[PDB]
């Protein structure tokens, strides 16, 4: 409960409005651009890392033209 960690994220809009995604030990090392690490791992990453992610993924939302967003869950 830190304003130094981030559990995950919820989405905004589209049909799964309001449904949230866990941030995983995988999103850790994608936040640094890399594959791996286990995605089922539920674990709250570092602000600085959440905000890699929220920016990178409302990117490809636009970039898709898609219908949805992301928000960081407070
Ligand atoms: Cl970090």
Known sequence: ?????????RILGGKRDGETVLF???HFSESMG???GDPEL?????????????????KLCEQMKLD???????
């Open 1 to 9: 409960t830190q304003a130094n960690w981030c559990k995950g994220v």
């Open 24 to 26: 995983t030990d995988a």
């Open 34 to 36: 890399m594959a791996g």
């Open 42 to 58: 539920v674990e709250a990453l570092p602000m600085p890392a959440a905000l890699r992610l929220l920016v990178k993924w409302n």
């Open 68 to 74: 949805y967003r992301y928000k960081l869950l407070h």
